[PDB]
Structure 1
Amino acid sequence: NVRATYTVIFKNASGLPNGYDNWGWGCTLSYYGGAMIINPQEGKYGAVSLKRNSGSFRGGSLRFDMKNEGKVAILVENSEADEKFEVETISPSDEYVTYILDVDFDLPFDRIDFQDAPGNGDRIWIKNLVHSTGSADDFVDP
């Protein structure tokens, strides 16, 4: 079977996704309108860090809808190795945009981070977060 595995982490969020803890820092999270809303603290470069409690992801791509007042760094991490990887930094947008990003990290990852890169407290809204084991080019949106 050469088709990808698509993991819908959350569609509309009314809390953390079942199977995930938050190992984030320097922010508060709220949930409204199906969005996970990150409110980072000024000067903390805060982030949500969704930690898959059991198991890991490998390579593939990350898909999500986001709007954001400031630049957002997308990272993944391997908690066993304590190794992080910067996937992309996304510029501000006042409207939701769908991103599909290749993850070229070559260790498995069990943490997915959305970070307030400028450290200015700019808010971030996320919906419809999905991992695919396949490439962004080959992604068909579940």
Structure 2
Amino acid sequence: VRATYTVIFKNASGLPNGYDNWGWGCTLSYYGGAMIINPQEGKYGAVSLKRNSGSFRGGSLRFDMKNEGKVKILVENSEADEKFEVETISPSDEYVTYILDVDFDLPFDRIAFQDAPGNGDRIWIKNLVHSTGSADDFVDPINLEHHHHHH
């Protein structure tokens, strides 16, 4: 019952180690540790972070995000040709941390962030982690590693 946390990236200066991007309709740039998604207008651009090898199953996704528009979070199984909408996130000027249960009943090898309104709103992502356990049971190894010196 020990949860496995998989840190996908903290600060990004490029595509996460062991991942490719199998989305469309965006350009990517990296500054301030953020993966900066620039969707093109009219494309509903997505970044689909594709594991080179293996799959996650269930549990929960943790990440920081700011975004000028609504963002659709998905997981996908490449082999089964199956997508699952995890959540749609409202616009925010400031980074907000989300921890979201993945209720998909299949393994997933892809985690996607999509420009839902398709108007080209930018999206900024940092600190992407997967846990095998639930959102309520998530003990963030990222925030824990900031305050370890104190308590």
Instruction: Give TM class, smaller chain.
Output: over 0.9
Question: What's the TM-score once normalised by structure 1's chain length?
Answer: 0.99
Deviations 1:16-65 (A, max 9, x none): 11110100100000000000000000000001000001000000000000
RMSD over equivalenced CA pairs, Å: 0.3
CA distance in 2, matches of 1:127, 1:24: 18
Unaligned runs of at least 5 residues, structure 2: 142-151
Q: What secondary structure, in the 3-state scheme, does the structure 1 residue paired with 2:3 have?
A: coil
TM-fit CA distance, 1:3:
1.2
Deviations 1:116-137 (A, max 9, x none): 0000000000000000000000
CA distance in 2, matches of 1:34, 1:68: 15
Larger radius of gyration: 2
CA distance in 1, matches of 2:122, 2:133: 30
CA distance in 2, matches of 1:41, 1:3: 42
Structure 1 ranges of 4+ moved more than 3 A: none
Q: Percent identity?
A: 99
CA distance in 2, matches of 1:59, 1:36: 24
Deviations 1:63-120 (A, max 9, x none): 0000000000000000001100000000000000000000000100001000000000
The alignment of Structure 1 onto Structure 2 pairs a total of residues equal to 141
Q: Which has the higher helix share?
A: 2
1:49 maps to 2:74: no
